[PDB]
Write a protein that binds this ligand. Structure first.
Ligand code: NA
Ligand code: NA
Ligand code: NA
Ligand code: NA
Ligand code: NA
Lengths: 148, 149, 146, 152, 148
């Protein structure tokens, strides 16, 4: 990914610190690997707080990465939180015509979330995937706009 | 320690299951007071359905809003459609108004679950406190972001 | 509740008249007991039709009450109607900054809906609850905005 | 019981029917058309689309220049989750349009688990229900109601 | 019996699960070509989540857009929120821009199910072709409705 021009925002929640930090770390790695060593990084408490800050960043950034973890608890809370946050991320991308890379984990168990958080032992790095998605899409959009 | 003395906070709390709602509200006030806000705008409504229009009304004139209430599953699918609509209303408003909305609306299957989350002396969790900490920390973050432009 | 100064709209479906008529009657009684003797009352056939009428009422009233019933049938239709209507009522309340009391029942059985329609044998009066909801919240907003 | 019909002769009506599962779609359209004629509208604007996913955008086009729109079609659950997401988004979409355009949208989009359920709701000679008829009634009655309110 | 020669067609296709994505795109291309459109605008993105923002970009300057891709259920609820939110986004865009968006985003439980709907030699269905047909035929309908 050659992403040197671009302004990247990263919004990462903090609930389940270890997972969130590792999501952040993976997002940062891909950004750095793509020419962006200093993305705008912001932290929030939980996933619920992510949309409003992703919105704030999207208005002044070419791309934003949304990072966090929701693990199902005892109640239906999980279902309404995951649906609303994910749909909020879709809205902001459309409203602002800016890609929002979705690295917000929605898992039934902790081990699932750990297995996707880009730790040494993880099957996947969702932080990295979200960053690649945000950046690659922003480049494509910049290419489309720079025509006619 | 959150220092929010500069900020205007609205709190809307439903009244359906008053023991729980009152405890959610008490947990929110405490965080606010502990954060330097002794006098937030507090408004009561009947049930969860009523919360969003008032959250909007408050979000327009406040830096942060906390939405508190409880919906407990009964016999019918009513639970599902209320929880989903209210929750998405709270998301819509925060985005429309670029104002954090702390979600302390409990959506439980049983009453014991709600009580266990209401920040009563016996409760596992204090959802009103978490929803106030969420809203205030987010508003200070937004404030910081906007002071850079 | 003193709501004398407030303009109130009520939209009630007519599908399943035992249920719908009883919901409307419970809402009317709250409105009357709150000092609103002449609310704008509008009937529609089914629940799907309630949103566009609620929207129309909300634009010229201080509160609106939505009443009807969706009972689950054989197909997923129930799920998509209840969700879409319910979310529509939320949209309208927000768009118009006017409360919309939700008295649209969404039940699995007809017996559940009867038991919520505020007939003399009913455990609950959801028309009454929807009306108190809309009117108390309207007074609250009035107060806030003053 | 005999009850006089809706008089909607002063109204402009649009009808959009999809085509997937065409004998069912055609039957919905015919039931809707019957009710429109009975109500005084022999020439509604009738438009056909491929599937239910195509219904919203056309319903919107019609809603801008008509007093009522009828939305007709069929989704039958298949193998995959596609049914759920399609049904939800289409139904949501019809709700959004009615609000955006303050114009009623009569919902005759069947969303069934089986073909037999759809057939039984499509107003065929042998059908239990005529959801096309129902959807046309809803849109037209609601439209007259709105006109009545707007005179106030 | 689709004559869209005079129409502007945009196609967005994700990349995740290449074989299927590529076949979906070949299916839509073939339909466009047969309908008189030999140079559609074709954009590639990483995954389903990235489809709507690009579909929006194209819908603003095209008479029709085709959205193509595949989401296959894995271990967590991620599938349900991505599917609901993408499908809802495509519906939103079509309405916002009054421009048809053909939906060729597969949402499946299994890989075999996706492969069976991707328009491969032995596939039961050609969802790319179906999405292109949908978008183009609806585009013509709107053109007629607007004509006088
Ligand atoms: Na931007
Ligand atoms: Na504000
Ligand atoms: Na009003
Ligand atoms: Na109209
Ligand atoms: Na366009």
């Amino acid at each position: 990914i050659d992403a040197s021009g671009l302004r990247l925002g990263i919004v990462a929640s903090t609930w389940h610190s270890r997972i969130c930090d590792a999501l952040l770390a993976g997002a940062r790695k891909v950004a750095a690997d793509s020419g962006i060593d200093g993305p705008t990084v912001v932290r929030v408490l939980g996933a619920i707080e992510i949309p409003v800050v992703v919105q704030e960043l999207a208005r002044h950034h070419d791309a934003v990465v949304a990072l966090g973890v929701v693990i199902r608890g005892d109640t239906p809370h999980f279902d309404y939180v995951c649906n609303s946050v994910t749909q909020g991320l879709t809205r902001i991308a459309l409203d602002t015509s800016t890609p929002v890379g979705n690295g917000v984990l929605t898992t039934n168990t902790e081990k699932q979330a750990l297995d996707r958080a880009g730790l040494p032992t993880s099957a996947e790095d969702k932080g990295a995937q979200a960053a690649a998605a945000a950046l690659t899409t922003a480049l494509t959009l910049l290419n489309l706009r720079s025509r006619i």
